[PDB]
Amino acid sequence: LSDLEALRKKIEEVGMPEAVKTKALKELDRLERMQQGSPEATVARTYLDWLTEVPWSKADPEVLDINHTRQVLDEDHYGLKDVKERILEYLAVRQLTQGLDVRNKAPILVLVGPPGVGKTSLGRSIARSMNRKFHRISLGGVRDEAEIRGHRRTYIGAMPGKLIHAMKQVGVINPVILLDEIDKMSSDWRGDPASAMLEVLDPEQNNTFTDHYLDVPYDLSKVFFITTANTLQTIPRPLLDRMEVIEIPGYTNMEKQAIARQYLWPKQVRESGMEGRIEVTDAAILRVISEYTREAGVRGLERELGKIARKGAKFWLEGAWEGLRTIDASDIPTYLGIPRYRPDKAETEPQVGTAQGLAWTPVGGTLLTIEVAAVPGSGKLSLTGQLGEVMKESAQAALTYLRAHTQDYGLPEDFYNKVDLHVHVPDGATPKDGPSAGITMATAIASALSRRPARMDIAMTGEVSLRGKVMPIGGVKEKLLAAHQAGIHKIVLPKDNEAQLEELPKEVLEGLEIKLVEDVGEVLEYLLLPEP
Amino acid sequence: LSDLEALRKKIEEVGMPEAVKTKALKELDRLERMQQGSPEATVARTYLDWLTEVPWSKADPEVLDINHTRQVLDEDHYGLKDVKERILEYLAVRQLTQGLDVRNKAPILVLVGPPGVGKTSLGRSIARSMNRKFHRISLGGVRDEAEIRGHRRTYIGAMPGKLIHAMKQVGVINPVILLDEIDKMSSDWRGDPASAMLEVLDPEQNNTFTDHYLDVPYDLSKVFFITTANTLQTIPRPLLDRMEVIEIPGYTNMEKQAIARQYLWPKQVRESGMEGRIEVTDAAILRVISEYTREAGVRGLERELGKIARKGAKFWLEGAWEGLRTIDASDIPTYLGIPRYRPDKAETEPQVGTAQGLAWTPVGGTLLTIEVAAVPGSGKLSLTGQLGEVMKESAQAALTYLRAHTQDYGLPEDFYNKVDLHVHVPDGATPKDGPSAGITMATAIASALSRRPARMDIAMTGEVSLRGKVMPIGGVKEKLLAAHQAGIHKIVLPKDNEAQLEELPKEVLEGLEIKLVEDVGEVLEYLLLPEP
Amino acid sequence: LSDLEALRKKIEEVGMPEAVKTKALKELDRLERMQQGSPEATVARTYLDWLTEVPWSKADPEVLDINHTRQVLDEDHYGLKDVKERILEYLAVRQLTQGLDVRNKAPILVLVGPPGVGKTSLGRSIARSMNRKFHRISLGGVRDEAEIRGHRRTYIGAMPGKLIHAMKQVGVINPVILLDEIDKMSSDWRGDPASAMLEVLDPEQNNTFTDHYLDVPYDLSKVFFITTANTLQTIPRPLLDRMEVIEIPGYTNMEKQAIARQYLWPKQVRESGMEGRIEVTDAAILRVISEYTREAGVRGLERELGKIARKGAKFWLEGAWEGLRTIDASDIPTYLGIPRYRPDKAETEPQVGTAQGLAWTPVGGTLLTIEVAAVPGSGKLSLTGQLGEVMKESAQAALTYLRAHTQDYGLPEDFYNKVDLHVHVPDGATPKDGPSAGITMATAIASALSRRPARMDIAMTGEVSLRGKVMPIGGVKEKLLAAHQAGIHKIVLPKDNEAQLEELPKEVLEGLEIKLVEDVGEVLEYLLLPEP
């Protein structure tokens, strides 16, 4: 009928590519009948529509400027001023894609950092700065080669791929596609679509990208892929090549104060119609940072300023008081809730077995408390709390040091066959391949067996090797940031990471009093309430 | 057909968008030729009936005041005194930007709670306060876009979606659609019921939301949508963003007695025509609350009072002799029968191996009676009833504290290799997850091994760590509503939550008698009824 | 000839509505020719043959009274004592709030039961009491709204809906219309027939009930509908509300003998053409009930007694010898051929590995038998035959209870590490596969391990908790009705259910014998013939 007229004109109201035109005229050969009824025309309808709605070889304009790009990139969340150099170096790699116009065997810009620190804002800034468009696909919980690839074109209700879905939305084949959480792909049911994303993510394979709900492979050559991920090593290992590690580290408190006064809170006030009626003094911004969110990103702070703006809308719709209200740090909890975090956690009044430890998580940096119970028995060892064997052998190494140092620290003649040990660590292994918490467990076990109070407010990290030698670790900047944002002021380190301390800004170093030591007896000296 | 002339008029009198004018006049130019129509006359005639009846350009007034909505939301069900403030905050934000400033990217008030606590009534109360026509749409068991969208325009058959019907009924273009039960909606059959919800969610896209029984995208810009879920867990994740969460939990008992004197027992005595002739004392309302239903909310209390009303109609229609009945707590069972439940918990005879945790299932809170058997055997452990390793960590932590302190509870000196344990959790699938039953299982295990009875009548909750400390648990208010409904009168919460404890409205802290602890030795001096 | 004359006279003589008079004019327009055949006008004469017969305001004088309806419902079956009370409450409410149509939207009487019991006899008794005119319509299995609503007079098959046939055969506007098997109505076709009966249910849209054959939609204002199902869990959920569960169970033996003596067999005699020639005492009716059919209702008694009476007529054909041919249970397989069912299910060989639980299918009650094979091996459990997690967990709980008490039951003092158990259930596909066979499996496992006889002729239901207890189970009346169908005389019930044992009729308790327990100790002292 006229629906057949529409789906028949769409064969030549969209000028198709050659093999696509061939299978389209075969779709019309199955057509020229009722548009509904039998199910073989309905699967023909979804097949025709999904193949004649995805756009065919059309693109946006493109810029080769760095100056206007620099202008826009200096206004995302305060401008990071260091990693934008790295992004300008990658866009200088775009300044050499000449012979074969892809430049793979070459980076693709994975963006690594805690969730929401401007990564998506960097994507939006690049999208505005190249006059492109933007779209997101989140790969969270992907294990299926019909989510990414096609599904069997023999059913009504089979699925086109997510990638072809998102390309069906955007009308060109140069969007900026944001692949969010590329690390959380899996392989449980119907193959591993990591190889599918690889075939998306090559020089000369995307331009004939294989589909199976689309029975011709579809051209995806010119899409500016941009990719973000929390971890660094849970990424598919052959796909870990052809990349550029853009580290976006976490912020500090003063930078988030600047972001609040300049970028966040003006949008929060304009998103509740209170232009010119509410203002916040900056000690209250310090209050919101230092008592109401403990993270590395700036998403929760945006929620808090949103709550304050919405309450201001209510209190001004119930009687117009003044031209300018001022909200100091006194009456934040009139507008917000209870103070959910104390600014001084130094009122913990040190524990007995607990070791305060630093940690490298996929969401960046955090603290931990390693929790050790020394119970009577016959001598064993157990570690719980979803740990891996790497933490277990690090504890093995710690005990191997401990067995040769009995009477020097307040321990029995032995504990390898008298005292059972149960160790909880609140998270498991590190995504970096290594237990970065050797001396943490060592101070915990020595504190619990010695029955001597381990001091809190002394965060620490560092390994204990099989020789008991304290080893240099990686990613030190983020654990130092995590110790900074909780207000912790003492760090125990291996000495050999001090070159790592060359890449640390000043205000972080003003509070972190570093004890660059080299052996396990030295943290036992500098930590416990006894001098040993 | 002069009715066909009327069809042409009712097309050509209501002011349409001119694309609808185009397609409707084309349907008139391809009708009036199949007068004996096999469905070509029929489907086109029903199509033009839909293009006449569906509301195009239909005006309806509005509030501009937060204050009249205060005046009206004191007259539905109660005041409820927390959620009234959140509703007015959302409307205060909506008022100061109405007039279409560019900040129309707003969330849409999901109302999470148990079934039947005043959600649809709250929609009706808001819709009275705005003078817009309320209407509901249920989404319980929606799986395919033939239900959200149209499916077949070809022959008369598959209808348009739910939305065009529920706009056709309401004579104006701006209802208050209540989309109930948005979490039970799932992709059951082959089809996507989530992305259509994301399209009706977003205020940029649904300016021209479309279906398939019609061929102009409909103008849904002015519908104040509002949804309703019972569980925040299983909501699709692209929908859980852009979603204002307002949490309505259940009522305490004295609020149930007050709602039943105000709004429920008079409408029930209206509903069975026996006004001014049946009388219910407040002890009777309290008896029917406490001894005949346990659900959170007031569904069951409606059905109970309906039964008393209809029985009164029967007893008066087999003889009229009075001026007025008078029920009290004496003759409830004469109208209802044997009590489904029992009186208060204070007579429930202390078991030797049982603990009464608190929980919040999404159909209302509950007690849990976790029961633990101490089987004389090897020394290993066993867990049944829908448990992962979270409960094994809790059991092992509490058991480690006991292995430290066998002297402190009359235990034998050695039972890691004497006694097996068999733990049975009665509801292992409480979806508000976590080890929030730490001293629950610690009390059960120390009761089962010490042969000394754990008391009933005292609820408790918390977490445990290997040193033997009680950490805080989140969600104090839902735990106290469960402990206040199910009949308990003594609660043991962790010490770390007393700053949370004054957050409550002071209804909830009336009957309850909180014993705040911080270590497991305190709850095992409370709950163990004899000395050891 | 003058068929046009008589029809124009009739259409003016039959009282039309005025809009119906206008559509009668537009049907009249195509007339005035005196030739037959007439493929347009044959449809017209048949349409007016329908339209001169549908009732327009003919009334039957309804009596209100709730005492006449009871003095007529005492001439239905032997006595139901519960559903007659519920029908008196419902019709009492419809006696007060009638005419006072401020209150409306009444529910519509779902009558739930096994097929066979007096559904339509309760319908006809109500219709005798109100002096209305009963007429059924069976709406089980219908998948098409073109059958329930009208049908198009544009291709041949120009018929009204079923409901206009039911209104043609009733010459008034206030009948009692019954809708048998409203849940067997399927929905796999063009037109969901649930929405049609939602419209017929509707007390507002009934006034313009749409037909695709009649032009003006019809009114269903006073038609007192009433519905029937078999289980209320397959009705669609909008239609499930605005129902009233009046739940009819099956009968015991004395009730079926009384129904056959009082009511059935005089009908089946005097419908045969025979009268006063046969004598049947209690023995033959006892035999025909117990050893010839396996149903809940009374279809089988009706059919078999009618076949007996017809073959008694056949024997009377070859001689009118005597007016008294006394029949009893001895000589009855003369008339019915071979008896089908065994005489004794009570004497069922009190052996070891057998357990005899009470259950119920939704065509009538049943007895589950449960086997346990106690083989040597490693110690692990096997469940085949529709055995999920709850039955296995109840088995595991019973096994733990045995491990607590190995001394006084003749067990091996360590058996859990030595004996494998194949627990087989033939019938888990029969409903309620959850825990109601707790002491069933406790007796099965205790006998199959202790190699002591588990008794026939004692039945049991309930649950077991882990410390060793018996919980209560709901729905006591259906279970004891099943136990009095299938021929047992001893029942084990929990202590906790004892209160519900005074909601039953007193007849059920004297044919049976209820052995209440509270623990597993009492049921293990009951059911072992030798105990050690």
Numbering used by the authors:
A (entry chain A), B (entry chain B), C (entry chain C): 243 to 774
Please give the exact wording used by the authors of the publication that reports this structure.
Lon is involved in cellular protein homeostasis by degrading damaged or misfolded abnormal proteins, which prevents these unwanted protein species from forming toxic aggregates. Lon is known to form a homohexamer; each protomer is composed of multiple domains, including an N-terminal substrate-binding globular domain (NGD), a long-helix domain (LH), a three-helix bundle (3H), a AAA+ ATPase module, and a protease domain. We show here, using cryo-electron microscopy (cryo-EM), that the activation process of the Lon AAA+ protease may involve a pentameric assembly and a substrate-dependent incorporation of the sixth protomer to form the substrate-pore-loop contacts seen in the translocating state.
Additionally, our cryo-EM structures of a series of spiral subcomplex oligomers of Lon determined by 3D reconstructions suggest a sequential pathway for the construction of the THT. In the proposed pathway, the THT is formed by sequential incorporation of the protomers, beginning with Ob1 and progressing in the clockwise direction through Ob5, and completed by the incorporation of Ac6*, whose binding mode is dependent on the substrate.
